[PDB]
Structure 1
């Protein structure tokens, strides 16, 4: 396999299906990437992650740099060896979680300094250091380091942050290219910014295309804007990106968000399963989500979902999983996570097949009618 090759096999409207070939494996698109935080996809062995259908996982740079540490992971042979996942890994830049999780942040044109939320130790990220950390981890797809644009953002502030992000995209490009081993074996994605503003999204797309990346993320969404607005921004934003490279919608999302985003030209997705306020009991089904903690499931012998081919739905009942989650048992988290990630992969497979067969628009309609019945 080559370092990086994206091929589009079939199209329907703005939707595409195809493959990304990389040294560590082939990624089928549209793709969902399970999120590994601190070098683990929560409650799953890597072989189980693979069994669900995942071709690639995401690793969180911010968490990894804090624990166990990037240099340590490099000394130990890299993230793949460390956690036992031998297929592609995309690493984020760490910037988002610095803003959301850390304290005492000091931002500048050079980067950001911050205090760890674990022990208040002082750390730093910059375009150069982020790229270096992702190299030390042995990442296959490296994300350019950008500046977080909060939602909502004024036009001036959105513009300033986008402009800084584009300067940082060039710095990221140069850092990546100057490191021979990384340039020859990994890929680099740029991130479009500009908040909800069409003119800024266009300037950002133009800047990224001029620099040139292996793929293009739509950044700055999934931060509270709501689906209608997100879809509105995608409507104009995705066509601005180079057609012949993958389009990655960072942090998205719910099944219906994924379907609509694919309808708008997105090829790659990631998100973390909810846990707060009993949401860890949320199971996806083709008839919409259910919360397995609900008392109505206490004697329900049916599987989580009636069609799902996952091992959890083959072997255990709603009643059992209800009990485990209510009891706070680790096996509850294991089974819920395996089923939910398997559900997402089955959704992606149905999306890929429907685009390949020129019936994706019909699939989207059928999906929504049932999911929201």
Structure 2
């Protein structure tokens, strides 16, 4: 039987790595892209379709699930895996980011965050976050953190990061005090420190002293732009333990993913393929297209000329254009399946190119064609 958690690096090129995470519920090929399951569904896809695209693991939003249908309710029904019908690994976020971005009213303190839902008063703390993630039956549990707004002054970035590190220790202890969770799940810590190298180093040191199964680079993709995100990754990823997975949450566009892998990132999640698919944006190897545009009304070609997904095997741009213009559910279904499949094909090409020692060339060829 598979272990609780084992990360193994099979090949490397520069800072990029390819390998596997073995967990009780399955193997995760890295670098990995996680489709986002907001409220117990990857929007517009059955779980079998998510798997057919190549996904090994999905993400669930703790903030949404604790509000609807409720964490205790999901536990009573047998956990998130059986509730939604996905039997493979699930990573749950902590709630610490969405509580601040999505709540109408919040009160922050050293204890945690109290908030009002957009749909009653609610509470999130390191302890409650770890508990909710346990009730959901999460395989990869995220420490409860604070995502510092950008831009941040050095003082505010430091104060925020320091609180996040105290919360990381509380998250570790809560997780370890629940025997079933400690034996069957993994716990990742989240580095903070905004764009400041010294704070990033202090955060990495604090997380490594506590000890986690994996390490995320938090606090990025919050308005700083790709140049600055890459500059921060340049010095931040090498601070993390080499032998554990490196996770960049909330990223991103295809070129963001490629450059982040070049900088040592092993795991990603983003709503872009699902949300923008529903809005009519399709990813192709020649860049994104907006299927709503009139130029596609009689285009018999598939969304992408090389894509192997079931949507591209069968339906035309012209048909999907009609569905999206008409507001048809099938339009959302087909666009989402293709976009998630495209993202998985990107990850497969990244993995294979690292394994063959030609990732640098792949990245160059990818960028030249995608931005032509």
TM above 0.5, yes or no, is yes
SS of corresponding position for 2:360: helix
- Do the aligned partners of residues 358 and 346 (structure 1) sit closer, same or farther apart at CA in structure 2, a change above 3 Å counting? same
Show CA shifts across 1:122-146 (max 9, x none).
1000000000000000000000000
Deviation of 1:203 (Å): 0.2
Q: Distance in 2 between matches of 1:279 and 1:235?
A: 33
1:275/1:281 contact within 8 Å kept = no
- Do the aligned partners of residues 57 and 274 (structure 1) sit closer, same or farther apart at CA in structure 2, a change above 3 Å counting? closer
2:278/2:335 contact within 8 Å kept = no
Show CA shifts across 1:211-269 (max 9, x none).
00000000001111100000000000000000000000010000000000000000000
2:277/2:336 contact within 8 Å kept = no
Q: Distance in 1 between matches of 2:34 and 2:114?
A: 29
Q: Distance in 2 between matches of 1:16 and 1:277?
A: 29
Show CA shifts across 1:18-65 (max 9, x none).
000000000000000000000000000000000000000000000000
Unaligned runs of 5+ in 2: none
1:279/1:291 contact within 8 Å kept = no
1:274/1:280 contact within 8 Å kept = no
Q: Distance in 2 between matches of 1:48 and 1:275?
A: 13
Deviation of 1:355 (Å): 0.1
Q: Which residue of 2 aligns with 1:290?
A: 289
- Do the aligned partners of residues 276 and 362 (structure 1) sit closer, same or farther apart at CA in structure 2, a change above 3 Å counting? closer
- Do the aligned partners of residues 197 and 114 (structure 1) sit closer, same or farther apart at CA in structure 2, a change above 3 Å counting? same
- Do the aligned partners of residues 239 and 277 (structure 1) sit closer, same or farther apart at CA in structure 2, a change above 3 Å counting? closer
Which range is displaced more, 265-274 or 61-70? 265-274
- Do the aligned partners of residues 277 and 215 (structure 1) sit closer, same or farther apart at CA in structure 2, a change above 3 Å counting? closer
Q: Distance in 2 between matches of 1:190 and 1:321?
A: 41
Deviation of 1:280 (Å): 1.1
Deviation of 1:148 (Å): 2.1
Q: Distance in 1 between matches of 2:75 and 2:277?
A: 37
- Do the aligned partners of residues 314 and 260 (structure 1) sit closer, same or farther apart at CA in structure 2, a change above 3 Å counting? same
Q: TM-score, normalised by structure 2?
A: 0.99
Q: Distance in 1 between matches of 2:276 and 2:59?
A: 25
Q: For 1:183-332, list aligned pairs within 5 A.
A: 183-273=182-272, 280-332=279-331
Deviation of 1:277 (Å): 9.4
Moved over 2 A (4+): 273-279
Q: Distance in 1 between matches of 2:228 and 2:322?
A: 39
1:36/1:60 contact within 8 Å kept = yes
Instruction: Report the RMSD for the aligned CA atoms in angstroms.
Output: 1.1
Deviation of 1:278 (Å): 9.3
Show CA shifts across 1:278-332 (max 9, x none).
9711000000000000000000000000000000000000000000000000000
- Do the aligned partners of residues 3 and 126 (structure 1) sit closer, same or farther apart at CA in structure 2, a change above 3 Å counting? same
Q: Which residue of 2 aligns with 1:11?
A: 12
SS of corresponding position for 2:272: coil
SS of corresponding position for 2:209: helix
SS of corresponding position for 1:237: helix
1:192/1:218 contact within 8 Å kept = yes
Deviation of 1:276 (Å): 7.9
Which range is displaced more, 270-279 or 40-49? 270-279
Show CA shifts across 1:145-188 (max 9, x none).
00120011000000000000000000000000000000000000
- Do the aligned partners of residues 324 and 9 (structure 1) sit closer, same or farther apart at CA in structure 2, a change above 3 Å counting? same
Q: For 1:94-113, list aligned pairs within 5 A.
A: 94-113=95-114
Deviation of 1:104 (Å): 1.7
Deviation of 1:273 (Å): 2.4
Deviation of 1:103 (Å): 1.7
Unaligned runs of 5+ in 1: none
Q: TM-score, normalised by structure 1?
A: 0.98
SS of corresponding position for 1:259: helix
2:273/2:339 contact within 8 Å kept = no
Deviation of 1:274 (Å): 6.6
2:90/2:138 contact within 8 Å kept = yes
Q: Distance in 2 between matches of 1:323 and 1:177?
A: 53
2:274/2:340 contact within 8 Å kept = no
